[PDB]
């Protein structure tokens, strides 16, 4: 059915990944990658690049598509169609703003308990350079009712 396009960008380097603690809005209190809605007349990749700069202060060269995840919240008519990207070549330094507080995390210290619960399923694939298609059904913001997750050759 009808789905709204979102982007999600993980700045993932060999020994660390950047996450930002979302200060306000839906899902505040959790460490997120950077992203959001795509604009009219904007390609998905261009929106991910824009949202990364807007939210982290970072400029990136190459963006690699690594996943597509569809989220359903029970009772909510709009599905979230989230296009996940990764990058390791960035320019700039992340900046705390009144919307997000950024921190680098060692790969063995990902704060899964303070992240969206679906991250525990697909972040491991992201970390092993796998690509994936995912679907997660939520009841509220805390409980996964069911899900599917499949490794793919083409996102
Ligand atoms: N990983 C992740 N980021 C999300 C943002 C909104 C709803 C569900 C989500 N799962």
Query: What stretch of H or E contains 49?
Result: helix 44-56
Ligand 1 pocket test target in 118, 123, 125, 134 with most atoms within 8 Å of CB: 118
Residue of the CA atom closest to atom 7 of ligand 1:
71
The torsion defined by the Cα of 119, 125, 131 and 134, in degrees rounded to 10, comes to -40
Residue of the CA atom closest to atom 9 of ligand 1:
116
Q: Is 54 annotated for ligand binding?
A: yes
d(CA 96, CA 140): 28
d(CA 110, CA 139): 24
Q: Name all residues whose Cβ lies below 6 A of ligand 1.
A: 27, 71, 80, 116, 118-119
Classify 1-155 by CATH class: alpha beta
Give the distance from CA 108 to its chain's centroid: 18
d(CA 82, CA 36): 9
Domain residue spans in the chain?
1-155
3-state secondary structure of 26: coil
Do 100 and 21 touch, CB atoms closer than 8 A?
A: yes
**Which residues, other chains included, contact 29 with Cβ-Cβ below 8 Å and sequence gap of 6+?**
21, 22, 114
Q: Is 123 annotated for ligand binding?
A: no
d(CA 104, CA 5): 27
Q: Indicate the pairing of strand 16-22 with strand 31-32.
A: antiparallel
Q: Indicate the pairing of strand 31-32 with strand 59-60.
A: unpaired
What's the farthest any 2 CA atoms get from each other in the chain? Answer: 41
Helix spans in the chain (H)? 44-56, 119-127
């Amino acid at each position: 059915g009808a789905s709204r396009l979102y982007t999600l960008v993980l700045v993932l380097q060999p020994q660390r990944v950047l996450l930002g603690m979302k200060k306000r809005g839906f899902g505040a209190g959790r460490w997120n990658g950077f992203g959001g809605k795509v604009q009219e007349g904007e390609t998905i990749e261009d929106g991910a690049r824009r949202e990364l700069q807007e939210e982290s202060g970072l400029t990136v060269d190459a963006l690699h598509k690594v996943g597509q995840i569809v989220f359903e919240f029970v009772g909510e008519p709009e599905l979230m169609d989230v296009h996940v990207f990764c990058t390791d070549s960035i320019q700039g330094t992340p900046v705390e703003s009144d919307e997000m507080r950024p921190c680098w995390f060692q790969l063995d210290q990902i704060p899964f308990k303070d992240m969206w619960p679906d991250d525990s399923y697909w972040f491991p694939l992201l970390l092993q350079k796998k690509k994936f298609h995912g679907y997660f059904k939520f009841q509220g913001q805390d409980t996964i009712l069911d899900y599917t997750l499949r490794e793919v050759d083409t996102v």
